[PDB]
Symmetry: D2
Subunit: 124 residues, 4 copies
Amino acid sequence: MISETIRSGDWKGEKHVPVIEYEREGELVKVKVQVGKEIPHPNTTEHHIRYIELYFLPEGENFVYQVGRVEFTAHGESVNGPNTSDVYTEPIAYFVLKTKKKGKLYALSYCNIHGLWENEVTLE
Amino acid sequence: MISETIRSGDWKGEKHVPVIEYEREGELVKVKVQVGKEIPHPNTTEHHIRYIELYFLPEGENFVYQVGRVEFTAHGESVNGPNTSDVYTEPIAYFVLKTKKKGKLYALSYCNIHGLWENEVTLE
Amino acid sequence: MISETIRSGDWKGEKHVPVIEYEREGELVKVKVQVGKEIPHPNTTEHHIRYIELYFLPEGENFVYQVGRVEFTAHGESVNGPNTSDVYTEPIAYFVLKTKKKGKLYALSYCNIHGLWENEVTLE
Amino acid sequence: MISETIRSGDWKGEKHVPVIEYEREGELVKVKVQVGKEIPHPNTTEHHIRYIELYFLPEGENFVYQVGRVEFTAHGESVNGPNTSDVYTEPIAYFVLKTKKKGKLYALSYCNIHGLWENEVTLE
Ligand SMILES: [Fe+2]
Ligand SMILES: [Fe+2]
Ligand SMILES: [Fe+2]
Ligand SMILES: [Fe+2]
């Protein structure tokens, strides 16, 4: 099972845990997912969060839907060496989702050296 | 050249043109990119914006950096047919960039049936 | 846990399950992953495999590494309607990995209406 | 224009240019794209090819289709430091395209400190 490589936890003590927050405005659900809300995650050429993915499993349904994927692609690398570009993409992802359904939202994130991480929250 | 397949234009009359807006806060540059600001773009199983990419070429430098990529992966598809899931991901992308440099930001977006689209703005 | 949305099984019954095969040639490991090895998986505008990801957990290590990601982006869509372009990308992904380590390879695939699917094989 | 950040050239002299080769087997077009054919390209934590994308503009049509995208995500990074994992993903991408149409194929690749690179061949 691939799940044996996915870690979870308390984002209060664990900096890798993706934190999911949302604000439902009408038929629009604005979701914010970030890594390092309490404990800041490094963002260097050698160590950084590569991306965050958001999934949505509607209440009572059998198939999860991938809502979106955000890749953080700049990590200081340049022809002058690692951490010299002064260009870094922070692990903060925003998704605007249009739905009137309820269910569960899942976040899947990947650190280039610390593997896969997940979290979830109920979409009321 | 691939540029012969990339279209551009004024987003006040062309719904496909990605619109770039940003807010500088310290060393943090918050960028918002969206397709269909004025003229909303369809988002159906048959026709939808697939993703938006953000690039940054610092002033006076020779190599552009990809800042990030956002894929909008839900477009109504379900086992019950096209446009039946009530789950759609709107073409609105947000990027949090950490840099003190100035330059030019580029947005590249792709429609599943209307090809590639671009736009750019100066990052002051 | 996201694992509750991930399905698995024998590829001899479920035309979904991603099938992993590899050939080691020294330091080079060529991996082939595909969905629909037995009974072909549909590839229409309405129903298709979006991508296949390959992961590698070296023997005795604690963090899994994402080896690669292949997105199949053409599914017949065109300005003339769904399934009219005559351009389809088959769900067959190849990965050339350079490593002398052994361990476990995992494949994760996403169907646009049937959720996430996984499979794994030991890399000797 | 984003094209001002995209470089092109002779693959026999520039170890960055993506080389496109294909084979037509009836209805299937097997496309191989690689960076570093003539002059292998560094693949270190600090300097590596991030991905290769393949596009297809059918003869006489107005909209280019993205056929696929392959991300090479492992570049030696580990908790031990840069270039210590012994896990690297080579910049070799394979695409299986189902189409009876002819036209032009374009490859777009991104090095992490060298920007965007392109190439194109006629699909007969
Ligand atoms: Fe980490
Ligand atoms: Fe469109
Ligand atoms: Fe399916
Ligand atoms: Fe390079």
